[PDB]
Design a protein around this ligand. Structure first.
Ligand SMILES: NS(=O)(=O)c1nc2ccccc2s1
Ligand SMILES: [Zn+2]
Length: 259
């Protein structure tokens, strides 16, 4: 079974041994060089339709926590932008640092943000998530940077439940959470073809990374950093620095939706 992580012996630099696609041609995340990203006037506005999103549960999976959604019909969908077709929200999660100066997976002109939110959606033309991840256009991940400043009121419900899912394998009911409260004002974005950022690192993702970060408070992110990678009763390993660093861009172009 999987033994990868973000510790001292099993971290990103080791993943390729079990998952050789780690050294593939379309791996994520990447550094976004803002000057080299070309404005593409053919890119459409992003359609984020979360009005009917139905959250169910929050889970500490040992590498992050996932806020899970009922994806058994088109309730919360992403379309437009660079996408063809309709992509259904399945879960969101975050990556964050041990300090505010790191935590994001994507970087912007080498800048690291304190954290990064990933809203994961699967292409409905493939019928289920597990089939979608086997396709080059199977997933669309909306990435949103977090900076530390003013609190995000829409995040507080998430923060407050974390004490109940401290350790790996714990979950809690988490209904009625509205992901719209995690979105910045602007939907300007960068897009490129890439991969999942955790094993198995499948090359199935159209990345949509919003330019505008959301602000969260230092107290909010401090509570992320109280989570544990370990299971109950095991030696405490704080869940921090659960980010994969930037990977080679290779033969890819990053496009901008904005001038
Ligand atoms: N961190 S992320 O790319 O949003 C992501 N990682 C994974 C791993 C397995 C399946 C899907 C995804 S989507
Ligand atoms: Zn992620």
């Amino acid at each position: 079974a999987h033994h990868w992580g973000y510790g001292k012996h099993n971290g990103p630099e080791h993943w390729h041994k079990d998952f050789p696609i780690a050294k593939g041609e379309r791996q994520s995340p990447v550094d976004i060089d803002t000057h080299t990203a070309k404005y593409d006037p053919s890119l459409k506005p992003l359609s984020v339709s979360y009005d009917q999103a139905t959250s169910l549960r929050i889970l500490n999976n040992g590498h992050a926590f996932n806020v899970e959604f009922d994806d058994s019909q088109d309730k919360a969908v992403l379309k437009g932008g660079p996408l063809d077709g309709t992509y259904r929200l399945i879960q969101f999660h975050f990556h964050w640092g041990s300090l505010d100066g790191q935590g994001s997976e994507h970087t912007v002109d080498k800048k690291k943000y304190a954290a990064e939110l990933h809203l994961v959606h699967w292409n409905t033309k493939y019928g289920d998530f597990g089939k979608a991840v086997q396709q080059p256009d199977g997933l669309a991940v909306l990435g949103i940077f977090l900076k530390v400043g003013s609190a995000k009121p829409g995040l507080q419900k998430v923060v407050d439940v974390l004490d109940s899912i401290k350790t790996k394998g714990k979950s809690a009911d988490f209904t009625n959470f509205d992901p719209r409260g995690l979105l910045p004002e602007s939907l300007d974005y960068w897009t490129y073809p890439g991969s999942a950022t955790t094993p198995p690192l499948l090359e199935c993702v159209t990345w949509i990374v919003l330019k505008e970060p959301i602000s969260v408070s230092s107290e909010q992110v401090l509570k992320f950093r109280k989570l544990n990678f370990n299971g109950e009763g095991e030696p405490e390993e704080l869940m921090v620095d659960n980010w994969r660093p930037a990977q080679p861009l290779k033969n890819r172009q990053i496009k901008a939706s904005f001038k």
